[PDB]
């Protein structure tokens, strides 16, 4: 292949090494389940329950 | 007698070196996991023990107590023999490394030649694992990996011949005594880079790694393959420090400390290269091994010879 | 401490073993293997002779011998691949058309 | 009109999610493994907004005959602002780290190429058809759900 | 309580042998290598759990294997289509002991919403399952929770130490159901956040 | 001597401990736990590796004694490496060293 292509490709590889090393120097984005509890929005569709009215009787 | 205690002390030094190298290979399989986590904006295994230190023992126990399995219509001796080669070849190649003044296993007259012998024997692990599995896909993958390995082993020796040409001997202690003023990373920079690529490629590391030839392996044989891979990484990094970075030489710290930091530096760079680089295609890899690196090593040796004969 | 006669006899043993393997085998691959055995035995004999006299010439002849062995193994395996492509069998007795 | 804008925003959020998955999966298929980790972090930002709005991540089932299941929750705009400030730097980093790498270009350029005639005769739509030069997008040719207002 | 396979029995468990069996179980539970197997959307959430924002590698369970021989855990994450069921059975048979199964999602659990002509109604029709995850899809942290449940199940089981010495039976602990374990705290919930806010 | 035989003993112990460790590792793996047509390009690449490996051995022997061979040795190694690169160029230009056509 062309020597210019080889030099440009070597530069791109060096750039990739540099960005991944800088990403190593960055801050972690990991949410530490189960030590860190998962934040769920209020309308999250998880476990189904049956509720009660304010008088204490079951609403169903 | 002083001779007997000197012999036993040297034997104890060799056994200590061997145990530390095997432990370094396994513990830096775990360290590769942790460093991949660190490079990938995550943590890696940090739960099994204090900081994940017992995760490796868990892996070792899991592979020890797995059901041993060999394919039925397959060869048994060749299948069992391939992981032994993949472990033993580079583990034995470590034996020439000078770690510090007074700590060497074999101060051979050949040295570097013994490393070349071990790599040449090391290709048989891939070939044997591919043939013995009685799988067409694994056989084809192993032939591909072996062709790549030969494509880079063909210039590994010359990439080191630059350093031997400067030092005038095959011995390792004389090579590190030839670095008392200038390390070979500066004059043998082409030799430095070509030995880096060759050492990565003969170890089947990223980015140098028809299905794979390890699919039929399981249990403790898979563990042999992987631990032999990381042991080879330790050996290649130590060879790199010995040849191009002065070995034990340093201004302030004790020599073993300097050797340890440089070896750890190059193993960290090994894992960083795994994390960062993308994997090229097959034909591009063989063409970069043959067309670029082999004439580069030949020209590097020629220019090195002309330079050293100039003075 | 090592006799020269013992090294020469070891080389002769390996040479005649390679010759026997060359003759008795119908498969061309084992014929090539026996040829490699014989040439390695000859190179070993040259190493023994050079080491007895304390000369480099034995190892130099060893280098020339293994260069020849590499070239001959390359050519022979190319010919064996050609035979397996054309005739789909490695029986050397079937390659016998010219006679008289 | 508010139904149209809500459905358009949800569809564009999920389109960004799918495209991030596709680009990261392509980069992983080439041989680079770290952009899939970062693209899944961006997918987690999108999933934070989608979880806030619909209460689910992957299969919201939130559109309805005649509208959507609920009104937008209070504070959705802050999460949308956070995602819109987070995304472009990450996308530029993805391009510079993987998409401009010459190894990826050698693996990708010229591979499995077809023109406009082959795309038309096989019913190819989407990015392949537009990559053949044919300017046919449903959101412009046959507009729906208030896409003409954007 | 325990279940025997080669029957409901008691705990069979010397003081060195018990400690070393505990070390075997600890090594097995802290080194779980899942099998790479993409069926449907549940696999997308499973590989989401593998990524950096969740980092299931912290538990030592990130080593994804393309070969069933090197995989200890099979995560059936997706619908069991009738054409894919012999493939799943063959992949499960190709695995080696000890092998564990996690059903991920309603499709793998029971067939889910696809009670249809071309779908097998749950992977436990033909493959034993140790941990079930409800959800469609379960979120990645639910997969991590099922992983922890699998570790608790593994750490309480008794397996043959060697194939030449000792009892070769496999003992699986009949653990308490998670529903009855969490019924104390789940029923006591009174007020939740209103869905109007964020 | 004393140091050379100490190093011989250390090297032999290194050999046997490494081999025994690998064999014991596989023995313990077998013990523990309970039970239940290729193209000619491969030949060409391996053949090229063999030929250039022998030529590399010649350069190995050259490189050790540069300052004992003078400029004549450099000249002879220069014709050697010129024929080396001529063969390499010959292989590259005809398609021998290309995996794909
Ligand atoms: C889906 O993406 C992938 C992963 O998830 C992040 C992986 O973990 C992996 C597995 C690879 C790694 C965890 C890094 C290499 C290190 C490994 C496997 C550690 C093994 C260690 C031993 C056997 C020593 C005992 C692959 C291949 C992958 O493609
Ligand atoms: C020093 C500390 C660390 C030491 C550890 C070891 C380091 C080395 C690790 C291994 C490096 C492997 C390099 C693999 C090279 C593969 C070459 C290749 O595939 O080239 C083909 C590619 C595209 O070619 P093209 O013809 O365009 O494609 C066909 C078109 N459809 O063409 C190209 O991409 C052209 C450029 C090819 C590569 C040039 C050399 C790259 C060297 C690796 C990067 C080093 C980065 C810096 C490292 C730290 C330095 C301090
Ligand atoms: C599966 C098993 C396969 C076989 C494994 C090995 C079997 C034998 C095991 C026991 C070996 C015991 C050690 C032998 C002696 C070691 C010391 C020695 O060789 O000393 C001689 C020489 C010294 O020279 P030097 O010190 O440089 O100069 C001063 C001279 N007094 O130094 C030398 O000559 C050094 C050069 C020779 C070193 C050879 C080391 C072993 C090489 C074979 C490795 C095989 C790898 C596995 C198979 C690969 C795939 C087939
Ligand atoms: C990856 C590196 C593996 C190295 C294995 C060998 C370790 C040998 C340790 C020797 C320690 C003592 C060295 C001589 C004394 C100089 C240093 C004194 C302070 C430690
Ligand atoms: S359970 Fe739901 S999310 Fe999982 S595979 Fe089935 S349809 Fe997809």
mmCIF file with all atom_site columns, C-alpha atoms in Angstrom, chain F residues 56-99:
data_model
loop_
_atom_site.group_PDB
_atom_site.id
_atom_site.type_symbol
_atom_site.label_atom_id
_atom_site.label_alt_id
_atom_site.label_comp_id
_atom_site.label_asym_id
_atom_site.label_entity_id
_atom_site.label_seq_id
_atom_site.pdbx_PDB_ins_code
_atom_site.Cartn_x
_atom_site.Cartn_y
_atom_site.Cartn_z
_atom_site.occupancy
_atom_site.B_iso_or_equiv
_atom_site.pdbx_formal_charge
_atom_site.auth_seq_id
_atom_site.auth_comp_id
_atom_site.auth_asym_id
_atom_site.auth_atom_id
_atom_site.pdbx_PDB_model_num
ATOM 1  C CA . UNK F 1 56 ? 17.572 -15.204 9.250  1.00 0.00 ? 56 UNK F CA 1
ATOM 2  C CA . UNK F 1 57 ? 19.891 -17.731 10.935 1.00 0.00 ? 57 UNK F CA 1
ATOM 3  C CA . UNK F 1 58 ? 22.673 -16.538 8.637  1.00 0.00 ? 58 UNK F CA 1
ATOM 4  C CA . UNK F 1 59 ? 21.964 -12.975 9.748  1.00 0.00 ? 59 UNK F CA 1
ATOM 5  C CA . UNK F 1 60 ? 21.892 -14.179 13.390 1.00 0.00 ? 60 UNK F CA 1
ATOM 6  C CA . UNK F 1 61 ? 25.422 -15.517 12.998 1.00 0.00 ? 61 UNK F CA 1
ATOM 7  C CA . UNK F 1 62 ? 26.480 -12.285 11.289 1.00 0.00 ? 62 UNK F CA 1
ATOM 8  C CA . UNK F 1 63 ? 25.105 -9.947  13.970 1.00 0.00 ? 63 UNK F CA 1
ATOM 9  C CA . UNK F 1 64 ? 27.109 -11.339 16.913 1.00 0.00 ? 64 UNK F CA 1
ATOM 10 C CA . UNK F 1 65 ? 30.587 -10.542 15.571 1.00 0.00 ? 65 UNK F CA 1
ATOM 11 C CA . UNK F 1 66 ? 30.249 -7.213  13.726 1.00 0.00 ? 66 UNK F CA 1
ATOM 12 C CA . UNK F 1 67 ? 33.432 -5.696  15.155 1.00 0.00 ? 67 UNK F CA 1
ATOM 13 C CA . UNK F 1 68 ? 35.406 -8.878  14.381 1.00 0.00 ? 68 UNK F CA 1
ATOM 14 C CA . UNK F 1 69 ? 34.442 -8.975  10.689 1.00 0.00 ? 69 UNK F CA 1
ATOM 15 C CA . UNK F 1 70 ? 35.374 -5.510  9.409  1.00 0.00 ? 70 UNK F CA 1
ATOM 16 C CA . UNK F 1 71 ? 33.829 -3.780  6.417  1.00 0.00 ? 71 UNK F CA 1
ATOM 17 C CA . UNK F 1 72 ? 34.170 -6.840  4.156  1.00 0.00 ? 72 UNK F CA 1
ATOM 18 C CA . UNK F 1 73 ? 31.658 -8.684  6.326  1.00 0.00 ? 73 UNK F CA 1
ATOM 19 C CA . UNK F 1 74 ? 29.283 -5.736  6.001  1.00 0.00 ? 74 UNK F CA 1
ATOM 20 C CA . UNK F 1 75 ? 29.702 -5.855  2.219  1.00 0.00 ? 75 UNK F CA 1
ATOM 21 C CA . UNK F 1 76 ? 28.988 -9.596  2.038  1.00 0.00 ? 76 UNK F CA 1
ATOM 22 C CA . UNK F 1 77 ? 25.981 -9.251  4.348  1.00 0.00 ? 77 UNK F CA 1
ATOM 23 C CA . UNK F 1 78 ? 24.862 -6.422  2.057  1.00 0.00 ? 78 UNK F CA 1
ATOM 24 C CA . UNK F 1 79 ? 24.775 -8.688  -1.019 1.00 0.00 ? 79 UNK F CA 1
ATOM 25 C CA . UNK F 1 80 ? 23.065 -11.290 1.217  1.00 0.00 ? 80 UNK F CA 1
ATOM 26 C CA . UNK F 1 81 ? 20.331 -8.853  2.301  1.00 0.00 ? 81 UNK F CA 1
ATOM 27 C CA . UNK F 1 82 ? 20.018 -7.497  -1.259 1.00 0.00 ? 82 UNK F CA 1
ATOM 28 C CA . UNK F 1 83 ? 19.204 -10.997 -2.538 1.00 0.00 ? 83 UNK F CA 1
ATOM 29 C CA . UNK F 1 84 ? 16.867 -11.345 0.474  1.00 0.00 ? 84 UNK F CA 1
ATOM 30 C CA . UNK F 1 85 ? 14.938 -8.202  -0.456 1.00 0.00 ? 85 UNK F CA 1
ATOM 31 C CA . UNK F 1 86 ? 14.989 -9.161  -4.144 1.00 0.00 ? 86 UNK F CA 1
ATOM 32 C CA . UNK F 1 87 ? 13.309 -12.454 -3.268 1.00 0.00 ? 87 UNK F CA 1
ATOM 33 C CA . UNK F 1 88 ? 10.835 -10.635 -1.021 1.00 0.00 ? 88 UNK F CA 1
ATOM 34 C CA . UNK F 1 89 ? 9.982  -8.168  -3.812 1.00 0.00 ? 89 UNK F CA 1
ATOM 35 C CA . UNK F 1 90 ? 9.644  -11.093 -6.226 1.00 0.00 ? 90 UNK F CA 1
ATOM 36 C CA . UNK F 1 91 ? 7.213  -12.871 -3.888 1.00 0.00 ? 91 UNK F CA 1
ATOM 37 C CA . UNK F 1 92 ? 5.167  -9.729  -3.201 1.00 0.00 ? 92 UNK F CA 1
ATOM 38 C CA . UNK F 1 93 ? 4.894  -8.667  -6.843 1.00 0.00 ? 93 UNK F CA 1
ATOM 39 C CA . UNK F 1 94 ? 3.654  -12.033 -8.166 1.00 0.00 ? 94 UNK F CA 1
ATOM 40 C CA . UNK F 1 95 ? 0.960  -12.511 -5.514 1.00 0.00 ? 95 UNK F CA 1
ATOM 41 C CA . UNK F 1 96 ? 2.781  -15.102 -3.400 1.00 0.00 ? 96 UNK F CA 1
ATOM 42 C CA . UNK F 1 97 ? 2.580  -12.979 -0.230 1.00 0.00 ? 97 UNK F CA 1
ATOM 43 C CA . UNK F 1 98 ? -1.083 -11.979 -0.651 1.00 0.00 ? 98 UNK F CA 1
ATOM 44 C CA . UNK F 1 99 ? -3.780 -13.956 1.159  1.00 0.00 ? 99 UNK F CA 1
#
